[PDB]
């Protein structure tokens, strides 16, 4: 085994990791929280069993393949290394605090615009990075794929990172202009970002009481885009950013290179926002 962590590279075996308990399983599981005995760093170790589900393993490896290539992107969770035994692969990842989905649940309400500003800057830069550097279109941008930590970091999650959920689907993905060719572009992921931002900013998923996925698709197409409400004191920058992302006609929808010059992103690039303390407090005062 090989870990690159704390600025050094260590030869390591699975025995050098102290198991601190299971974190989760069944999607890109199974995930252990572990401590590296040579340094005291705590990490998340995802285990891919050789006897495990073939569709599950394929997803794990396609995601791992992107993560390994994105070491130079600070907005994407990092892989410290891998251990391959005769029966398993253990994948050592940066351990994050929780997802934005859970954070909305813990808070049972809106996340503050200032935290969402910092979130938008990070996640657009991750997505732009994935498209420009690797040609990857994420296809599943939603709050459960946005991770936050006690260090104040905000990152796009490793899960499904190689490129999802019907609820965040863009109108052109539901109603393709022409299925082939090619399919759709990064603009679909821009729409999903917009939906995620509205959900997080208001505390509620914007298509109300849909009983099925198909019902949300129907509302996406039949209804007006669900913009920030005007009675909540959102800044004009933020509303315009959401309204740009939620442009139903995809041809008129801005790409990342344009979103990155939007006033909402420019302002949040430099605004001092103490995401780490906010996150510690929310995690303190919570759960629900």
Curated annotation (Swiss-Prot):
Its cofactor is Mg(2+). It is found in: Nucleus; Cytoplasm. It catalyses: L-seryl-[protein] + ATP = O-phospho-L-seryl-[protein] + ADP + H(+); L-threonyl-[protein] + ATP = O-phospho-L-threonyl-[protein] + ADP + H(+); L-tyrosyl-[protein] + ATP = O-phospho-L-tyrosyl-[protein] + ADP + H(+). Its EC number is 2.7.12.2. ATP binds at residues 23-31, 46. Activated by phosphorylation by specific MAP kinase kinase kinases such as MAP3K1/MEKK1, MAP3K3/MEKK3, MAP3K11/MLK3 and MAP3K12/DLK. Its main location: nucleus. The DVD domain (residues 377-400) contains a conserved docking site and is found in the mammalian MAP kinase kinases (MAP2Ks). The DVD sites bind to their specific upstream MAP kinase kinase kinases (MAP3Ks) and are essential for activation. Dual specificity protein kinase which acts as an essential component of the MAP kinase signal transduction pathway. Essential component of the stress-activated protein kinase/c-Jun N-terminal kinase (SAP/JNK) signaling pathway. With MAP2K4/MKK4, is the one of the only known kinase to directly activate the stress-activated protein kinase/c-Jun N-terminal kinases MAPK8/JNK1, MAPK9/JNK2 and MAPK10/JNK3. MAP2K4/MKK4 and MAP2K7/MKK7 both activate the JNKs by phosphorylation, but they differ in their preference for the phosphorylation site in the Thr-Pro-Tyr motif. This is Dual specificity mitogen-activated protein kinase kinase 7. It comes from Homo sapiens. The lineage of its organism: Eukaryota, Metazoa, Chordata, Craniata, Vertebrata. The chain holds residues 104 to 403 of 419 of the full protein.
